[PDB]
Amino acid sequence: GTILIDLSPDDKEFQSVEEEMQSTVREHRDGGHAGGIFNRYNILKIQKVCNKKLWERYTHRRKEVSEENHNHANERMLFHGSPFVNAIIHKGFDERHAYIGGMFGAGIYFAENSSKSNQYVYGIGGGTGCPVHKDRSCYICHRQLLFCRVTLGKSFLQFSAM
């Protein structure tokens, strides 16, 4: 039931998403090992993901969380990089998409920095990079990221030594 709708580059919506992508690139402590060496992206396409069933699943849970947190969903727009992005857009997020070994616990991880999510496009630690060239810093092969609506509710603040 998922359809993908292309946004025009002349559309303000496209432009906003591109600017969130570009403006949240940072340097990483691995020198580029996992995600590659870059300061900016070439955005090729931005598609809206439309699935009525998945949306209803989302808004029902949002309402439960909002009520439990005294009428505050604490909803954000956040990046997600994953080798399962094709599965996610069709079937929704679930336990198969969790990072079991993640340092903040076994759950589904999202980033404010686009470049942090870019580190997971080819798997944990960038895996072995792109399929065609086995290059984690491949400048040829097309990558995909999700920019997602995420309900945080009451969020536990964990400072991390990173």
Partner 1 sequence: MAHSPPGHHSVTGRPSVNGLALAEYVIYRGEQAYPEYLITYQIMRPE
Ligand X SMILES: COc1cccc2c(=O)[nH]c(-c3ccc(C(F)(F)F)cc3)nc12
Token pair 């809206």 in the structure block, residue: 48
Distance between CA atoms of 153 and 127, rounded to whole angstroms? 32
Selected from 87, 98, 108, 138, the binder of Zn ion by CB under 5 A is: 138
* Nearest approach, Cβ of residue 70 and ligand X (Å): 28
Name the minimum Å distance from CB 7 to ligand X.
21
Q: Is residue 130 part of an annotated ligand binding site?
A: yes
Residue 81, classified by CB atoms within 10 Å of its CB into exposed (0-12), middle (13-18) or buried (19+), is buried
50 annotated among ligand-binding-site residues:
no
Rounded to the nearest 5°, which phi and psi values hold at 137?
-110, 30
Tell me: is residue 133 an annotated ligand-binding position: yes
CB of 162 to Zn ion, least distance (A): 28
- Contact of 130 with 121, CB cutoff 8 Å: no
CB nearer to partner 1: give 108 or 124. Answer: 108
- The correct pick among 11, 19, 30, 38 for binding partner 1 (CB under 8 A) is 38
Residue 4's H or E segment, with its range, is: strand 3-6
CA separation for the pair 11, 51 (Å, rounded): 22
Q: Give the residue, chosen from 133, 144, 149, 154, that forms a contact with Zn ion under the rule CB under 5 A.
A: 133
Cα radius of gyration (the chain): 16
Where in 46-75 is the site for partner 1 (CB under 8 A)?
46-49, 54-55, 57-58, 60-62, 65, 68-69, 74
C-beta separation of 64 from 24 below 8 A: no
The residue range among 5-13, 55-63, 114-122, 152-160 that interacts with ligand X, by the rule CB under 6 A, is 114-122
Residues that bind ligand X (CB under 6 A): 79-84, 97, 99, 102, 109-111, 116-117, 120, 123-124
